[PDB]
Amino acid sequence: RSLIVTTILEEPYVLFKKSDKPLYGNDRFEGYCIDLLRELSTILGFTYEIRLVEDGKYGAQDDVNGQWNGMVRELIDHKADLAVAPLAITYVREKVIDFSAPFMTLGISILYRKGTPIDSADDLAKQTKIEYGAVEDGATMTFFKKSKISTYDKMWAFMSSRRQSVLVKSNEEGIQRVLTSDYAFLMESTTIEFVTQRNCNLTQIGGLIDSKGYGVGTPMGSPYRDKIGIAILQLQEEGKLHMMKEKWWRGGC
Amino acid sequence: RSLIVTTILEEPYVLFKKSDKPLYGNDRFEGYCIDLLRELSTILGFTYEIRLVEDGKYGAQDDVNGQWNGMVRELIDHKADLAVAPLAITYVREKVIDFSAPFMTLGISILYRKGTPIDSADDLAKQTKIEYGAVEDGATMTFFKKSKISTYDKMWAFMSSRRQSVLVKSNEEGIQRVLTSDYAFLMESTTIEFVTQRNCNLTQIGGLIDSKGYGVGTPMGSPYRDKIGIAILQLQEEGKLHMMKEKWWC
Ligand SMILES: N[C@@H](CCC(=O)O)C(=O)O
Ligand SMILES: N[C@@H](CCC(=O)O)C(=O)O
Ligand code: NA
Ligand code: NA
């Protein structure tokens, strides 16, 4: 039986292939996560169908009913067998689904314009002129929402007080927001690493605010958690994941 | 019921506490992994007995008979509930035991003296005057043993042909070897970082050769795997793992 694989458009992990003729099914997709999915498919010997998360979200829990959305929700309701995307491994998520060994390490950080006085999250926290934000219902926003670290708690007070105006629908909207206003975008380090390559005016501010990994998501108790985990450790050890990142992290500047 | 926790002596993760008054049981130990163990115990609400792995090994598989040793063996045989140690998460171990989410990330690198022209693994591989080696029956040795990569295959040929002379029983023995002879030691970058803080004549050569994490080990299928994973992710996210590292790490 073919596995249902939920994912989400996000350069350069997952993106539509550009071509003159219409592409169909799995052929439509390409990127780091796609190559990874291919590798896993070969190593473990399964067939699959790629489906984009219906609500177009990563995954967050509503604090009124306690229900999840996005890919996480899709996994909880067994609507998909795997989630192969830049899906962050967090404690709130690991509580409701199972992750594989991480295939990539990263960390929350800041995207801003070059040559400013701003140098750390602390600098943004103790001022209100420069607005800052994050992707809504993402792991970053949740990090700030759950944080008890003074600075980050402050920053979350700001963000929540300004939800409609500072929380964006996607990394792309956040980036453009940085490019079109006095705005600092809290986002994941790897994606910043890719983004600054196509914008000479953009840069990462400070260091990593935390340390996490991307993992393949599976429903809780799934037998694919360990299989896929092993496969990922193998790929990492023989240097294939590194090669894949080399391949997909290039895009003038 | 109390859990049995296997571990291994290794500064600064686990060491015997210095004291004038004789210490007993868990009181005997301190280090990064002991603090970690304490946090897991607080969060998950278990008690425990720390026991050093009897054979003093991390865990590798015997080529001939296929038997495992060390902490990995202790977990396989259900002689321990957890392994809390600087135990590298690897593909081959993951096939026989389970690991929590990593509490620390690292990679294999090179410990050597300062001031030489040696700048990489490749530099070591293409010569023989400077001997080099690794801990026997550990993740690094196994990495070299399994690698299809030319340079690393060549280094494995070198190490294996001189196994008796260049492989060591412990990190400390490899460090002493670096300190007392023309020898380069292949070891994990976190511990290198700890060492080059106490020996100002030593340094890491080159970057990371691979990437891996240390995880808490459990037997395959253990229900504790997930609970510990969640606790580790919690600790990471609140900044505690970082504080522990700052605490325990010229
Ligand atoms: N990769 C994130 C989404 C983007 C972000 O949170 O910055 C997640 O898994 O939720
Ligand atoms: N930390 C290693 C032992 C030391 C080494 O191999 O460098 C292990 O888990 O086996
Ligand atoms: Na889980
Ligand atoms: Na396993």
Side-chain angles (χ1 to χ4, degrees), chain A residues 1-249 251-253, chain B:
Chain A
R1 181 183 69 90
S2 297
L3 301 181
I4 303 298
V5 174
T6 183
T7 193
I8 193 173
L9 293 182
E10 188 70 66
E11 195 176 0
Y13 310 95
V14 183
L15 50 152
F16 285 122
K17 263 145 76 174
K18 59 171 181 296
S19 73
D20 39 51
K21 296 178 180 177
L23 304 172
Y24 299 92
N26 299 345
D27 182 31
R28 289 168 301 163
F29 306 101
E30 72 173 0
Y32 177 95
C33 288
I34 303 303
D35 287 349
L36 177 61
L37 179 57
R38 175 170 301 102
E39 288 290 347
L40 300 173
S41 174
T42 291
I43 298 180
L44 300 172
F46 62 77
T47 54
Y48 57 93
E49 179 193 341
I50 305 182
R51 295 175 183 170
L52 292 172
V53 57
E54 294 287 359
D55 60 22
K57 299 178 182 178
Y58 285 82
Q61 164 181 305
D62 173 87
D63 40 28
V64 184
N65 58 25
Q67 297 186 351
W68 289 82
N69 57 19
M71 297 184 285
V72 179
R73 179 57 182 269
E74 288 203 1
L75 292 175
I76 299 178
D77 290 341
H78 291 210
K79 284 191 171 63
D81 306 284
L82 303 177
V84 181
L87 185 61
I89 310 172
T90 65
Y91 73 89
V92 293
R93 288 177 178 167
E94 188 66 55
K95 261 146 129 282
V96 290
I97 64 177
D98 287 341
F99 280 98
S100 75
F103 53 85
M104 187 178 304
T105 65
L106 56 142
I108 298 178
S109 194
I110 306 173
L111 175 66
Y112 196 43
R113 301 185 192 179
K114 290 181 174 179
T116 71
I118 309 301
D119 200 33
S120 69
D122 180 37
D123 295 348
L124 295 176
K126 56 183 183 60
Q127 67 82 46
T128 56
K129 175 185 299 179
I130 310 173
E131 292 191 325
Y132 49 89
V135 177
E136 193 171 12
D137 287 10
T140 296
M141 187 218 70
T142 300
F143 169 90
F144 284 97
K145 179 180 178 180
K146 295 278 193 171
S147 188
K148 292 168 179 173
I149 307 292
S150 193
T151 293
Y152 308 150
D153 173 89
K154 205 168 185 297
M155 298 177 62
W156 172 246
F158 180 92
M159 277 176 277
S160 70
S161 86
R162 295 170 171 84
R163 293 188 59 91
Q164 339 300 343
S165 49
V166 306
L167 296 187
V168 295
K169 285 221 153 302
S170 63
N171 282 307
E172 193 167 13
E173 182 177 339
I175 297 162
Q176 184 60 10
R177 178 62 172 277
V178 174
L179 292 172
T180 67
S181 63
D182 209 349
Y183 181 86
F185 189 52
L186 284 292
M187 59 177 304
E188 293 166 329
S189 64
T190 46
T191 307
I192 296 178
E193 182 179 347
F194 178 83
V195 158
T196 63
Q197 291 182 38
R198 49 186 48 187
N199 272 116
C200 309
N201 214 264
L202 297 195
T203 190
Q204 171 173 312
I205 298 299
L208 268 36
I209 292 182
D210 74 337
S211 176
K212 62 183 57 167
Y214 290 153
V216 172
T218 75
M220 188 144 51
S222 176
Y224 280 91
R225 176 204 61 90
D226 196 40
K227 291 183 178 182
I228 289 183
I230 293 170
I232 285 173
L233 290 171
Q234 175 194 321
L235 292 171
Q236 172 67 245
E237 165 143 333
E238 56 193 41
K240 311 191 80 168
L241 298 185
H242 182 77
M243 285 178 179
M244 293 167 56
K245 180 168 186 179
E246 298 296 309
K247 170 182 178 180
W248 285 107
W249 264 252
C253 263
Chain B
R1 176 187 67 92
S2 289
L3 303 185
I4 299 300
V5 176
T6 186
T7 191
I8 190 171
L9 292 176
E10 191 75 58
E11 214 183 343
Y13 310 85
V14 181
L15 51 148
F16 282 120
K17 171 97 170 175
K18 186 62 190 308
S19 182
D20 32 25
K21 292 191 176 186
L23 298 173
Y24 306 98
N26 295 336
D27 284 330
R28 287 169 300 160
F29 308 103
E30 60 176 7
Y32 174 102
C33 285
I34 307 304
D35 283 354
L36 172 62
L37 172 58
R38 179 173 307 108
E39 301 281 0
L40 295 172
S41 165
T42 297
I43 291 166
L44 299 174
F46 62 84
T47 52
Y48 56 83
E49 175 177 348
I50 299 166
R51 297 187 184 164
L52 291 176
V53 58
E54 263 165 48
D55 72 357
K57 296 177 183 175
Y58 282 87
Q61 187 174 106
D62 185 283
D63 278 332
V64 173
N65 67 18
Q67 297 313 121
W68 286 86
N69 58 19
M71 289 181 287
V72 176
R73 184 57 185 263
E74 294 219 2
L75 294 170
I76 292 171
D77 289 351
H78 282 229
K79 287 183 167 66
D81 299 285
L82 310 175
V84 179
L87 186 65
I89 301 161
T90 66
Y91 82 80
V92 293
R93 290 169 174 169
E94 196 65 47
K95 290 159 169 170
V96 296
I97 62 164
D98 276 335
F99 285 101
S100 75
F103 55 83
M104 192 173 299
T105 66
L106 59 136
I108 294 167
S109 189
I110 297 158
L111 178 71
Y112 192 46
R113 331 187 293 272
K114 292 177 174 176
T116 86
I118 297 306
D119 200 33
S120 65
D122 171 55
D123 283 344
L124 283 176
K126 68 187 182 184
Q127 61 85 61
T128 50
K129 179 179 154 49
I130 304 166
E131 291 195 308
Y132 55 90
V135 175
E136 194 163 12
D137 286 336
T140 298
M141 187 204 60
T142 299
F143 172 84
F144 286 94
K145 179 174 180 175
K146 297 287 180 175
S147 186
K148 302 320 178 177
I149 303 297
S150 181
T151 295
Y152 307 150
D153 168 80
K154 188 171 201 303
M155 295 169 67
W156 177 240
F158 174 92
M159 293 189 275
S160 63
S161 69
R162 294 171 182 72
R163 93 164 301 101
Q164 303 301 78
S165 58
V166 307
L167 300 183
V168 295
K169 300 181 60 179
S170 66
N171 282 293
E172 184 178 32
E173 186 179 342
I175 298 159
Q176 284 307 130
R177 191 71 172 274
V178 175
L179 289 167
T180 62
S181 71
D182 198 6
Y183 180 85
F185 189 46
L186 281 287
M187 58 173 298
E188 291 169 337
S189 59
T190 39
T191 309
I192 293 176
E193 183 187 350
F194 173 76
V195 170
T196 57
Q197 278 178 40
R198 288 60 181 176
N199 301 267
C200 297
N201 68 296
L202 301 191
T203 186
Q204 187 178 286
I205 302 285
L208 269 41
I209 279 169
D210 68 2
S211 176
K212 72 200 73 190
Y214 295 142
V216 175
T218 70
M220 202 150 66
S222 169
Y224 273 99
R225 179 203 65 84
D226 200 42
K227 293 187 176 189
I228 287 168
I230 289 160
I232 286 166
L233 292 166
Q234 176 179 343
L235 293 166
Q236 189 68 283
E237 171 159 5
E238 60 200 11
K240 178 79 188 199
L241 297 185
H242 179 72
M243 181 187 88
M244 301 169 44
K245 166 95 182 290
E246 294 299 314
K247 173 177 178 185
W248 290 102
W249 272 250
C250 300

